Write a protein that binds this ligand. Structure first.
Ligand code: SF4
Length: 225
């Protein structure tokens, strides 16, 4: 379907059915969004909430996190798994304190330079917390776009990844970008799921190719072997 229709239908859906009450969505700041994104990378929302609250209480600012001993950070992380995320989290806090005066950077290049932060995550931090014009491409987004536009091939290959980044940019609006990006993650997480996606609850059901062809299993493509 047309790019302008994609954006409008997703935004209208978010307004009435989207999640807007999570802790990291109230009184948003780059620090809070960054922290939530790292915790959410490999952990479900229900498990993350208590940890997010404990971290914000112990570390009100990024400088407080930077000055704390690494052992205390790892102790508070216990139970979230994938500790490389925590080690990079502490190094990034120290980089913000050292190079940016304790104020989380608000430009793409500076954010993407932080340990543990990639292209998609940097775009998420800045679009969600400040409304800057950047698209995202996590597992959730790849699933929705690949199915709606029938993008076959394994995203692990450069040519396929490039096509998906181009599509995301095409459908991502400037006006309301913070609402649109959160909505796309919401959809891929609860509606357009890995298995048995719930088409009847999706705002893209009237134009999605996978839904029309009953071929959601083909997108995104899997690693060939
Ligand atoms: S209609 Fe079905 S496959 Fe298509 S984006 Fe929505 S949930 Fe995914």
């Amino acid at each position: 379907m047309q790019a302008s229709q994609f954006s409008a239908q997703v935004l209208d859906w978010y307004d009435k059915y989207g999640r807007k009450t999570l802790p990291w969505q109230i009184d948003k700041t780059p620090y809070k969004v960054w922290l939530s994104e790292v915790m959410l990378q490999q952990t479900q929302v229900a498990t993350v909430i208590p940890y997010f609250e404990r971290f914000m209480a112990r570390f009100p600012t990024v400088t407080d996190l930077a000055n704390a001993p690494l052992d205390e950070v790892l102790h508070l992380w216990t139970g979230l798994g994938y500790y490389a995320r925590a080690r990079n989290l502490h190094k990034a806090a120290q980089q913000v304190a050292t190079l940016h005066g304790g104020k989380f950077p608000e430009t793409f290049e500076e954010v993407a330079a932080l340990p543990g932060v990639g292209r998609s995550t940097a775009g998420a931090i800045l679009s969600l917390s400040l409304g800057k014009h950047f698209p995202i491409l996590d597992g959730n987004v790849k699933r929705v776009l690949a199915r709606c536009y029938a993008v076959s091939g394994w995203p692990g290959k450069k040519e396929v990844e490039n096509k998906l980044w181009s599509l995301s940019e095409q459908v991502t609006p400037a006006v309301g970008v913070e609402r649109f990006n959160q909505a796309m993650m919401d959809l891929g997480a609860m509606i357009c799921t890995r298995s048995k996606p719930k088409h009847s609850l999706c705002p893209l059901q009237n134009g999605c190719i996978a839904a029309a062809n009953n071929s959601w299993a083909l997108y995104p493509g899997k690693k060939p072997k």
